[model samples]
Target: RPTFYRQELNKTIWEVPERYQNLSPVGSGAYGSVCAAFDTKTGHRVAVKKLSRPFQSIIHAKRTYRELRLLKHMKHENVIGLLDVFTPARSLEEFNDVYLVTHLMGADLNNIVKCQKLTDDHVQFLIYQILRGLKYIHSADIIHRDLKPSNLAVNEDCELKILDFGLARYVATRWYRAPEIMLNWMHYNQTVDIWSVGCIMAELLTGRTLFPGTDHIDQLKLILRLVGTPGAELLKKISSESARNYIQSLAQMPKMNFANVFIGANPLAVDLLEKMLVLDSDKRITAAQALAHAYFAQYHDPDDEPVADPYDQSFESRDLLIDEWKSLTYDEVISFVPPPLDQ
Candidate 1:
């Protein structure tokens, strides 16, 4: 007979309780496998994420440590909630698999955009939630480097939660990715996230991708065609010598007509979109500032101020050996406890 692996945290590495029944695969990707399961303990439907070979490589090690540390330390309504964490590994030597328990969402924004015809009100609410989450993340001095539609989870009620931090240190999806990252700029800030918001906003409005760049060079070309050629001032910011020279070689292109692109759309919405999709990273509108814009006037409240929850830990820029990164993760996990949900 074949041995079946079930839940038990004591002797062996499998920490998933047997109480989680009817396990069905829901999502899978480079980071991990996600499944929807029912928790018999509290009758709560939860998502189980099994991190793929967490200690197998330096890249995986860094991603695993960062995701755990960030999720444990940060708390926000718009961000996905981490209900629990466990490793099947009984000892440090045996540690290999890690699992995360979180609230099960209906579907991601990518699916929602494909099926629904989002009205102006829907657009306002969805974008509002995204900005609110980004506002909290940026205040902590951390960038959510990845902000594609698939990473934003949603349900029937239009509720949205941001997820997936493995790529938070670097690039996001190509479609919603920012020009700064595409150009491989030396230094970037929270604005990279803002650029993604603009792309999402445009996609939601048009029911299609705004800039579907095939590759790095094509991505630049697509953006220039729509937003017009970057002036010498903004071009000066491109640290990559090849990228700067390429831009200089291209003929100057005029900006597209927003009035036509978003015909019959809300004037305020169009105006806000323009502010966010700028090529100059320094000129992008911030999440906090976007919340206060007239486009979201109906949803804005003066008493709700942006909060700063600084995550002061420094992250590694380059990959390190598994043991070296493991030590760093251990210190972070031990130093902080996940904040209460009420906070």
Candidate 2:
């Protein structure tokens, strides 16, 4: 919570002004809005996310602070960065409504997979980047409850960055959310992000959501079909009897082996999804574990010194990408353009 501008401070945070004050808004959400702008000092493109005004109490003000605290130090090439925050001293109002600035990612996954047909390799690479990003986030003991295509943005380099950690919780999402979430499992750890990676993987391959449930009840039905219904023992582990009863009231759904339904999928894809959807959170594959799987190994030679980053798995030269990769310096793949940065 900050208020007055101290001239001697000479900080860019105060000088930057509200991004929306001059630049056009790119997007908005329940918590705040994002705008695209140019930084006069750095002469680089940037996006600014301004938090919403404070609510009735100190508790609400602190929530915004908590979000900034979480986003600030967490860094990886595929996760959005929080570069700046602006507010005046004693101004809790401005602090609650501060702007978060970061580099802008040009396109998003939801838009890409919608029009372009993703090959098996493309699918593998996309999932790899997501898991890699999730791995980084979860390593710090953060759970990204909301992982989906819409939350992944692609840059001009075709690298995928996980965006919008807004819905993410120190905990996990609901069931069909992740089986681990249902057990009220305290020891769940970071595997929740892994579960979301599975959900997103299915959506990309099938071009339809694996679980398009309308409500919690409907979501559970989808989960039951995908992961099998929680029996008496599973229900018993739930902390609240009311939650357990609510679950039991739902009708049983016909099970899907997925091996049969998801025809033409890579065998590795099926295997990876199975491990991801495990009812036991402890049993789910970790990002590190998944990266080691033969599935990723099929296209990526991890043992090789210059293994391709997961984002560019296909290795195809194209209109936007000169090489089919974002990380590796594959000798055979042509460079699309002069390096964006002066090397």
Candidate 3:
């Protein structure tokens, strides 16, 4: 009989409660650390996230528990699922934080963006997966602030799943952050995800981090350079009266308008990019609006097909619904025959 593992968030290395140890460190993020290992009892490969130890305050534990609570309710193919949590020790002296386990996956979008100069169709395929994922997240009324290349993972069959819900806070990251958060507006909703989508989309086209800045001021300079300096006319959109005061506090500035920055690259790409990086936060395009834009349709070429969905994984009919077939590994995803190297 196969033994089943269940919930327990603080498993320790010395005890080996369910028979597991860190085989290799796979990745780490702001909130926690991750490792790849096989269960000694079941011999099943799994990924584990060793959460960062909290300070003395019990409030920190409450906050950590809140994030985990949110994860418990979230479920979708595009979003990563939490399989189980381990807790071998109860006291702070023994195990200081939580350890979460999940099924292993393939490379994330970060790896893809860094390595390949992808074609237009490849970009479309990626966005399609993102839209599917976002639809699920948005439905639950959860805002995923840190929607970047790394958050989106591609499995062995080229199937996409989103991970790193650590910064998946209700708040946005200051760099890919929305204007409402910047101007001190406390109550906002899914609009933050829209800004992140814009940034991620632009990066996909340019093969670079859209807004690279050292600090808040440095980000403002990058913003000023990309989107032109907002005139008095543009300042009207800011709900907060202190908008000018905030802009004035910035140090370095830029000269070129955002549109002209990518004048030489793909024209269609520039069109989509311009709409997202608009200075006025209100003027920035929403995800739905960007999806409707004709720029995407203009550049889309279905003839240049993807390598093929090798795994034949089955999924409910969303867009590219999978049919029943054998599962495959990552190498087979993009390895479909292509006549010759120059064909």
Off by over 4 Å in 2: 1-22, 28-31, 54-56, 88-97, 165-176, 180-187, 231-239, 242-255, 298-343
1 or 3, greater by lDDT? 1
- Candidates 1 and 2 compared by lDDT, better number: 1
Per-residue C-alpha lDDT of model 3 across residues 164-229, encoded as one tens digit per residue? 645421123566765455556654566667666667766776787777666666666666776656
Off by over 4 Å in 1: 1-15, 28-31, 165-172, 305-308, 317-321, 327-343
TM-score of each: 0.87, 0.72, 0.65
Query: Using TM-score as the measure, what is the rank order of every candidate, best first?
Result: 1, 2, 3
**Candidate that beats the other on TM-score, 1 or 3, i.e. the better one:** 1
Pairs with steric clashes in candidate 2: 1-91, 1-92, 2-88, 2-91, 3-88, 3-89, 3-91
Overall lDDT per candidate, in order of appearance? 0.77, 0.60, 0.56
Candidate 3 is scored at a TM of 0.65
How many times do residue backbones clash in model 1? 1
**Top candidate by TM-score:** 1
Instruction: Count steric clashes of candidate 3.
Output: 11
**Model 2: ten consecutive residues of lowest lDDT:** 324-333
lDDT of 2 by residue, 1-343 (tens): 2233222111123234533234545644422456677755456677866555533344444454446555554567677766555543233222223556777777777678777767888888878777777766766656667776767888766788887645421122342266555434554667777877887788778887777766666676677776776666666666666667776777755456878877889988998998887766666888778877777875444443122223322222222321212112221112212123321
